[PDB]
Amino acid sequence: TQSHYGQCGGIGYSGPTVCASGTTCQVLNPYYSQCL
Ligand SMILES: *[C@H]1O[C@H](CO)[C@@H](O)[C@H](O)[C@@H]1O[C@H]1O[C@H](CO)[C@@H](O)[C@H](O)[C@@H]1O
Numbered sequence: 001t002q003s004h005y006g007q008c009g010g011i012g013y014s015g016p017t018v019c020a021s022g023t024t025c026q027v028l029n030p031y032y033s034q035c036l
Pocket residue numbers: 002003004005006007016
């Protein structure tokens with residue numbers, strides 16, 4: 001899973017998108033979504 005404060009869903013982001021249990025994937029910007 002993605003770490004806390006990590007990107008959880010960018011458009012074209014091939015890395016860890018699934019937030020860790022206890023973190024919310026908050027889309028902050030078009031490509032930047034962060035596990036908060
Ligand atoms: C958490 O770790 C992931 C890799 O294991 C990264 O992909 C994430 O973006 C996230 O890293 C960022 O946030 C953490 C918060 O603890 C910082 O420690 C990292 O340096 C980085 O800024």
